[PDB]
């Protein structure tokens, strides 16, 4: 069941998105006048809907765009040049879509603004289709420099159960 999100919570989501993506990208994802609702996926995971479209994952009080939301955006913008991006080669794709974390050897580019602990999204270098979202285990700079080590802890990927119910 969908419960309305408070104005205070809406403003905090906007604040989070603005910090992560900049005010311009954030503004198209959510504005302070939108009807925002929350649905439960499971006991640690919520789905935030903006005017009835699934837009964000929420884990406790922290949000990030869903893979479906980024997928739709990838038909408008080239996500290969976005903040919080982790760009992977074609060899990395099937592993990630099967639930694997992102390994440094498969990363072809990353936002240098990324710090360890940051929410990131993962996109493949051809169509810039998003594959996953997760938590950076390396800085963006380190992701570009290293060809060894785990780079991103994936928390949601295309083809997973969240994808099934949001896509």
In units of Å, what resolution does this entry have?
Answer: 1.7
Q: Where exactly are the structural domains of the chain?
A: 1-74, 75-167
How was this model experimentally determined?
A: X-ray
Find the Cα–Cα–Cα–Cα dihedral 159, 78, 128, 161, rounded to 10°: -10
For the domain bounded by 75-167, which CATH number is listed? 2.30.130.10
Contact criterion met (CB below 8 Å) for 65 and 82:
no
Dist. CA 103–CA 92, nearest whole Å: 8
DSSP string, 96-128: HHTTPPEEGGGEEEE-TT--TT-EEEEEETTT-
Tokens of 2: 């969908």
For the domain bounded by 1-74, which CATH number is listed? 3.10.450.120
Residues near 103 by Cβ (< 8 Å), separated by ≥ 6? 92, 149, 150, 151
Tokens of 103: 């390994």
Distance of CA 80 to CAs 5, 90, 147, Å?
31, 14, 19
Dist. CA 120–CA 115, nearest whole Å: 10
Count of positions (residues) in the chain: 167
Residues near 132 by Cβ (< 8 Å), separated by ≥ 6? 67, 96, 102, 121, 122, 152, 154, 156, 157, 158
Distance of CA 37 to CAs 9, 63, 93, Å?
10, 13, 32
């Amino acid at each position: 069941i969908k419960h309305p999100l408070s104005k205070k919570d809406v403003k905090e989501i906007i604040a989070q998105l603005s910090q992560m993506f900049g005010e311009e990208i954030a503004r198209k994802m959510l504005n302070k006048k939108d009807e925002v609702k929350v649905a439960e996926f499971d006991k640690t995971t919520e789905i935030i809907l903006v005017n009835d479209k699934p837009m964000f994952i929420r884990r406790k009080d922290l949000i990030f765009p869903l893979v479906i939301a980024l997928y739709n955006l990838s038909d408008e913008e080239d996500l290969r040049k976005w903040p919080r991006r982790v760009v992977v080669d074609e060899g990395a794709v099937p592993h990630i879509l099967n639930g694997a974390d992102v390994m440094a050897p498969g990363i072809v580019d990353a936002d240098e603004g990324i710090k360890e602990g940051d929410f990131v999204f993962v996109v493949e270098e051809k169509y810039g289709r998003p594959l996953a979202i997760g938590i950076a285990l390396m800085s963006g700079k380190v992701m570009k420099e290293k060809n060894r080590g785990k780079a991103v802890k994936v928390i949601h990927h295309a083809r997973d159960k969240i994808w099934e119910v949001t896509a």
